[PDB]
Amino acid sequence: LLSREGEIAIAKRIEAGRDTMIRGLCESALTFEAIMVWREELGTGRILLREVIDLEGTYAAINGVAAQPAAGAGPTVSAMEGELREGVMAILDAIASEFEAFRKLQDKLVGSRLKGEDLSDADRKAYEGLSATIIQHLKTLKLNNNRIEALVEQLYAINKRLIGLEGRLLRLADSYGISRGEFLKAYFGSELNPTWSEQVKAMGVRWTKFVENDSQSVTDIRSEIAALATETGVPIDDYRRIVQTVQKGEREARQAKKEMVEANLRLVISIAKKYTNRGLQFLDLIQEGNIGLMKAVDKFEYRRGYKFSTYATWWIRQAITRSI
Template sequence: MEQNPQSQLKLLVTRGKEQGYLTYAEVNDHLPEDIVDSDQIEDIIQMINDMGIQVMEEAPDADDLMLAENTADEDAAEAAAQVLSSVESEIGRTTDPVRMYMREMGTVELLTREGEIDIAKRIEDGINQVQCSVAEYPEAITYLLEQYDRVEAEEARLSDLITGFVDPNAEEDLAPTATHVGSELSQEDLDDDEDEDEEDGDDDSADDDNSIDPELAREKFAELRAQYVVTRDTIKAKGRSHAAAQEEILKLSEVFKQFRLVPKQFDYLVNSMRVMMDRVRTQERLIMKLCVEQCKMPKKNFITLFTGNETSDTWFNAAIAMNKPWSEKLHDVSEEVHRALQKLQQIEEETGLTIEQVKDINRRMSIGEAKARRAKKEMVEANLRLVISIAKKYPNRGLQFLDLIH
């Protein structure tokens, strides 16, 4: 890419201002190549939101967009007024962290039941995106199948691998992941929910006692193995970017999404992808350090030549052939650069993916993590807001306000 990261982000923001919104897919497409970390992505999404540009799952209806456009200027003016007033009265404002926290929490609205379900679905969507990304990483499926083989050989327990399966036909009936957190339900509704939770808890205990149906597990893992073989063979025969291969990858993701992995196993798969990405970053940073810092090759030239050719030395030979003052110096680091390129080639052989594909999968995984984390943060804030709103109803009852909250 010829554009530097700042230019790409500027284009992203410009697009958002013109449309009045951005979708997560657009954020993914316009993110700089080197941004794959979930924390970085979350910061960028937060920055975009702070500018009055909503980041959404899909493009909104025209009516919703008109409503958003009508309120955008008012929101911006209000935000500017708040910033101005905070600067003008900074000396007079309290520095008590508790009061500052209470004031901040006061801006968080109590959730309605619909809002709670919406957040729960967004958490689920984010987790699903992570799991779909993991499904595209061949080593993840291989690992899962190997672990199940250990279960079949009675070397491991099935309950240490999965907690159950998701019914693909029940996807529309997703329940919130946390019951009535920060909601505005009546006490009767809350009591009813608590009774249902207790009954569910009894059912869960029974499930734990009876374990997971081994026949169902055998059937699901056989389906996963069969689809994995078809996907792998199609990719080998036609290439990963072929339409037929993409269709099989999608089918594999749909099968894999049905598995509810034990958190420890899910984290292991996600972390293994992160480790692979770290290995890629290490070699790419080394190559850039050798060329840009040591040989004084302009960074723009390096990015233009290197991106998309990470495991080939054609870009390096082209850089030498440019006959620039720094071109001759590249001969001095040739051996080290080629050693790093070989390590990148080794990663491609291990994963069955190109470096570009490894980055793309990790970026989509990170966006899924950022989506789930943002939704969880909203749920936690709403929960705290509910606690504070309840505590405010019981002042001067023998306990300090903070003790009531605790």
């Protein structure tokens, strides 16, 4: 069903969605703490190269060919790792340095908001630059899909805790007769403001009663919230935006991938037919084949000109065989 141009278009949408995800993720301190831990665990053999990066994709990128399953003369997983390790460590190293630089301005920005003011125009432009170069760099690292998904999960988890704390504040305000709209307009954007409770008092008797009579709960929740802002190295409203950014990119990538899998079902089937009596049901063969297809999609590099279906066949086949 897909032309070569359709295959490319899908690859590009996946890559763009992924980039949007990374773009959002790189604003959070946690994503780079995670990458620092992975650097650590690699350096000490706690984890293997293959769990951090897309091993076959990276190795294929050495000669600009198609990614293929690891091993009769082809390279084993250990072989690929041996070829790639030094370069991956070098990149993680360079990135560590750029993260430190970036995190200094993160702390500057969060602290600045905590005092009420904002980053100097220079410190801010520097922030922008660092962000850009870091996103590009991380792109050259070719992270494992599971690692990116782990980052996304962590980000969203934080967001769930935030939404909980805001829910509490919301009903609290409600009991003093402050509507959702009234509250959210008074609250969005000022989550780090130290003089918030004193400033909202000026909004009248309901607000005054709210933050004086129930000052305890209020200051507690706002403390917890502020702790999220600390745990992620960004102000709360920024975190809101990051989360939406990542969700958007994620949905684009997911949809593009889905389209690609659907469009290559026929291929999957035609491979499943060759493995009918080998112990598994036809539908099982299909689903496994699809796991393999999805892997081919994850590792597909359109820029290198190789035909998608014949490449995908290796991964489909590997998934089927392994299940058997």
